[PDB]
Each structure stands twice: as C-alpha cells, then as structure tokens.
C-alpha cells in the first residue's frame, strides 16, 4: 500500500 | 588476520561472505509470518550517528544486506560508498518507517559526511524517496505483539522426565524468553534442575494428557494454575482404526539421548491419539523405563532403510557385533517385521533452507545453550545442524520445522544469551 510520508529537514509518497 | 574484538554476526558474515537463513524459514519465530515485505533496498528511518550534535536525530537508510533479523544499513546519499555502513536489528526500537520522524515532528538531519555532497535536500529526498518501499503499516505494533507470548509464568504443564523417559511429570513455567520456556519440575531433585524448551514444543502437554493418552506419569505426593489446554501446539490427527503401528515393528529413530545419531528402534507401545512408545535395541531397561514417546507423525522416526538409501550413518544395536549392520539379517534373527513405509508418509515443506546457511540453534544436548550454527546437510525435511568451531561429531539431526532453530539475530532481539563459535 502507498501513502503520503511526511519529511522534516514537506512530504513524499512511498510504498509500505 | 588479527581479530581483536568479540563476536558479532555482522563482522562474521561480512568477513567470510556468509549467508543467513531468512526469518521466513522459521514459522515459530517472531515476525516469522509477517516478514514478506522486509527486503533489500527497503528504506527506513534510523538514528544518525554521524552527528557532532549532543542530541539524537534521524535519517533515511536503505537495507544493503539482510541476515535474519539483522540488516546492513547505508544512509541515503552514500550511493556506493560503504564507508559508514552499519549493522542493526531491523526489529529494533530505533528503527521506524519513513513517515514516523516528521509526522511526529522531528527533523531529519543529514550525516555530517555528506552534508555538502548535495545542496538541496528537499529536492534530494523527493527524488529518492518517491515510490520507494518502506515498512508496512503498524509494523512496530507487529514487532511488539510478536514479543508477547501466551505462556505466562506459574503455569503448570506435563513434560517428559529427563532421567526417566518413559514417564511424564509436572513442571512449572518460571520464566519466558523469546517464546522459550524455562520449566522447573514441581518436585525437583536438583537445585537448578530446569527444562529449556519452546512454547510449541511437542514435549509439553496439558495437565491430564498422560492419563488420557495412556502415557506413564509420576504420581505426586503455590499460586500454580493449570495451563489453558488451548495454548498447546496442535498435534496432527491420525486414523489408527485400520492398519497401524504394532508392538514389535522395527524402525529407525533419532536417539532422544543423542540427537547426533539415528538408531535401530522398535515400537514398544501403541497409545491413543497417534502417540507411540519407542525403544532403541541394545539400550533398553527391562522395566521399559528407557522407552521414549514419539508421535506417529513425528519427523524423528523413519522407516527401515531410510538411512541407507539417503547415505546416513545408522547406529546399530549396542553390543551387536555382525558388522556392517544389515536390516535383513537383523529382522531374521529377531523374528520381526519393519513398520510399513506408508505409515511414515508426510509432507515435505518448501522450507527454504540451503546448505551453508547460518542460524541460531539450540544445543539439543544442553537446551540452555543457543549457539552460532550452520546447516551442513539437507535430507528432504531433515537438517544436519553443525555448531561452528566445534567438532562435527556433535552435529545434530533437526527437523526443518523445529521450534528449536532461530534466525540470525533472534538472541539479540529476544535478549537471550548467544554462544559464539569455539576459539
């Protein structure tokens, strides 16, 4: 399943 | 060629280019059935040790190499640079999925080594992580639940008498580590007399099993309650109404007192629900106290001629002198038949074990010990387990579905002590 993964250093979309 | 550190699975595997049996090969093991998504190139979030900062922060890392529970990680942005590759237990507490750091509100800090290898990190991570594989949803919950076992301390079970194989006696669960139970006999004769075994060991049974099945038991003369029978491993149901095992039938069996050998054996008793009492010729007390209990579906018993056709050393009767041993001559001398091959028919699982694979294996001669081991032979579902560093004389015959075998890293994960190879 794919979701919108949060990134802090915005968002990226990845498969789990 | 100068090794000045203690043992670690990581360096042991890298140095000799070893291969570890995947967690998949161990049904009984934690996450043994929820492991299909774990693979190489899977991205995770792990603490960034490449920080001069006094605090702790995370970064993205990809799995370079997977050995059991242990995964070799490389920080995202190193590409082919293996300079900072580090080992970890992928089921460890600090390993999270990729959304975990920001959705919880902590900043991803790039390793100090590659801080100026790329300028724009937002664009970097977007290009790298988009459509990338990561950890399944509620994976940390899966790992947590796998560490929670239904067998609780103070539970009473029936287990074989270590010094009197023909009978069972009541033992009590005193401690549970990684699904392994430390049993203590209710009426011990020794100070630290224990019985290490797994939860789903075929050697433990509910209270009343011995009486019900017809198996001998020791008659006895504190918060302890009986184990709920529905917690025990289910035995494969058989049909013993027609043609079945008979007393006197000859067979081959793994000696429970020496798991390195397969011996000429005899059916001594046919019990209920498929269980059988078996003795080894030449090593039987007259009162039948040496008779051990194997189920009919047990992978430890074999039809006559199994060892020969598969080129396995058979242990002839103790004191028997007509060597080399021939079954034909022995059946004539003892006036007996071989148990029909069709009684031993069993499925051979696609276990996924390969010769040379590393794993963590219980010493079956000393269940206390769990040691660095290797699979050296495979006979269908029969595995020859070697303990690294030690003599191959002590290699043990183990079933592929045995709950006494464990993936690489199982000890570190469960907190059990691991024995390193002999010096």
A5 with B97: Cβ contact below 8 A: yes
- Name which of A8, A10, A15 is nearest B131 (Cβ-Cβ): A15
Same domain, B389 and B272: no
- Rounded to whole angstroms, how far apart are CA atoms B19 and B68? 9
B130 with A10: Cβ contact below 8 A: no
CB under 8 Å to B310, separation ≥6 — which residues?
A: B379
B129 with A7: Cβ contact below 8 A: yes
A9 with B107: Cβ contact below 8 A: yes
Task: Report the helix count and the strand count for chain A, using DSSP H and E.
Answer: 0, 2
Same domain, B121 and B32: yes
Tokens of B150: 């239904």
CATH of the domain at B10: 2.30.30.140
Q: Please state the three-class secondary structure of chain B as a single string.
A: CCCCCCCCHHHHHHHHCCCECCHHHCCCCCCCCCCCCCCCCCEEEEECCCCCCCCCCEEEEEEEEEECCEEEEEECCCCCCCCCCEEEECCCCCCECCCHHHHCCCCECCCHHHCCCCCCHHHHHHHHHCCCECCCCCHHHHHHHHCCCCCCCCEEEEEEECCEEEEEEEEEEEEEECCEEEEEECCCCCCCCEEEEECCCCCEECCCHHHHHCCEECCCCCCCEECCHHHCCCCCCCCCCCCCCCCCCEEEEEECCEEEEEEEEEEEEECHHHEEEEEECCCCCCCCCCCEEEECCCCCEECCCHHHHCCCCEECCCCCCCCCCCHHHHHHHCCCCECCHHHHCCCCCCCCCCCCCEEEEECCCCCCCEEEEEEEEEECCEEEEEECCCCHHHCEEEECCCCCEECCCHHHHHCCCCECCCC
- Name which of B122, B132, B135 is nearest A9 (Cβ-Cβ): B122
Same domain, B202 and B246: no
Q: What are phi and psi of B218, to 5 degrees?
A: -80, 120
Same domain, B57 and B108: yes
B125 with A12: Cβ contact below 8 A: yes
Same domain, B25 and B89: yes
If one counts the domains in chain B, the total is 4
- Rounded to whole angstroms, how far apart are CA atoms B170 and B172? 7
Same domain, B410 and B300: no
Give the A:B interface size as CB pairs under 8 Å: 66
Same domain, B41 and B57: yes
Resolution, expressed in angstroms to one decimal? 2.6
Domain that holds residue B296: 240-348
Q: Give the closest-approach CA distance of B199 to chain A in angstroms.
A: 31
A9 with B103: Cβ contact below 8 A: no
**Among candidates B126, B123, B42, which has minimal Cα distance to A13?**
B126
- Rounded to whole angstroms, how far apart are CA atoms B282 and B265? 9
- Rounded to whole angstroms, how far apart are CA atoms B224 and B230? 18
Same domain, B51 and B37: yes
- Name which of B105, B109, B134 is nearest A15 (Cβ-Cβ): B134
Same domain, B302 and B359: no
Nearest CA in chain A to B57: A9
B137 with A3: Cβ contact below 8 A: yes
- Give the domain-ending residue among B146, B165, B192: B146
**Among candidates B340, B349, B304, which has minimal Cα distance to B325?**
B304
Residues from chain B that touch A8, judged by Cβ atoms under 8 A, are 101-102, 105-108
Residues from chain B that touch A2, judged by Cβ atoms under 8 A, are 131
Count of beta carbons in the 10 Å neighbourhood of residue B16:
9
Same domain, B157 and B233: yes
Residues from chain B that touch A15, judged by Cβ atoms under 8 A, are 131-134
A9 with B105: Cβ contact below 8 A: no
User: Experimental method used, please?
Assistant: X-ray
Peptide bond into B324 cis (omega under 30): yes
A3 with B99: Cβ contact below 8 A: yes
Same domain, B106 and B6: yes
Q: Give the closest-approach CA distance of A6 to chain B in angstroms.
A: 5
């Amino acid at each position: 399943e794919q979701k919108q993964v949060q990134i802090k250093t915005f968002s990226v979309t990845m498969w789990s | 060629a100068v090794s000045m550190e203690g043992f670690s699975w990581g360096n042991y595997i890298n140095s000799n280019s070893f291969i570890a049996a995947p967690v998949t090969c161990f049904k009984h093991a934690p996450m043994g059935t929820c492991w299909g998504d774990i693979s190489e190139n899977v991205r995770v979030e792990v603490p960034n040790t490449d920080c001069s900062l006094p605090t702790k922060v995370f970064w993205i890392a990809g799995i370079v190499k997977l050995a059991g529970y242990n995964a070799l990680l490389r920080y995202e942005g190193f590409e082919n640079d293996s300079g900072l590759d580090f080992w970890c237990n992928i089921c460890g507490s600090d390993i999270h999925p990729v959304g975990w750091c920001a959705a919880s509100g902590k900043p991803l800090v790039p390793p100090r080594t590659i801080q100026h290898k790329y300028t724009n990190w937002k664009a970097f991570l977007v290009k790298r992580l988009t459509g990338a594989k990561t950890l399944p949803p509620d994976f940390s919950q899966k790992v947590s639940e796998s560490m929670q076992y239904p067998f609780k301390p103070c539970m009473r079970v029936e287990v074989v008498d270590k010094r009197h194989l023909c009978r069972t006696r009541v033992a009590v669960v005193e401690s549970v580590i990684g699904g392994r139970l430390r049993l203590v006999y209710e009426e011990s004769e020794d100070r630290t007399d224990d019985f290490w075994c797994h939860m789903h060991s075929p050697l433990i049974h509910h209270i009343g099993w011995s009486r019900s099945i017809g198996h001998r038991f020791k008659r006895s003369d504190d918060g302890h309650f009986d184990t709920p029978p529905h917690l025990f491993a289910k035995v494969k149901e058989v049909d013993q109404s027609g043609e079945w095992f008979k007393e006197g039938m000859k067979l081959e069996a793994i000696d429970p007192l020496n798991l390195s050998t397969i011996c000429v054996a005899t059916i001594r008793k046919v019990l209920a629900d498929g269980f059988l009492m078996i003795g080894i010729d030449g090593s039987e007390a007259a009162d039948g106290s040496d008779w051990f209990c194997y189920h009919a579906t047990s992978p430890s018993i074999f039809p006559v001629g199994f060892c020969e056709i598969n080129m396995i050393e058979l242990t002839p009767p103790r004191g028997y002198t007509k060597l080399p041993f021939k079954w034909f001559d022995y059946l004539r001398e003892t006036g007996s038949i071989a148990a029909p091959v069709k009684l031993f028919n069993k499925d051979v699982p696609n276990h996924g074990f390969r010769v040379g694979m590393k794993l963590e294996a219980v010493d079956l001669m000393e269940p206390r010990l769990i040691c660095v081991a290797t699979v050296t032979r495979i006979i269908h579902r029969l595995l020859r387990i070697h303990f690294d560093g030690w003599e191959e004389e002590y290699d043990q015959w183990v079933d592929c579905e045995s709950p006494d075998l464990y993936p690489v890293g199982w000890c570190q994960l469960t907190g059990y002590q691991l024995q390193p190879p002999a010096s």
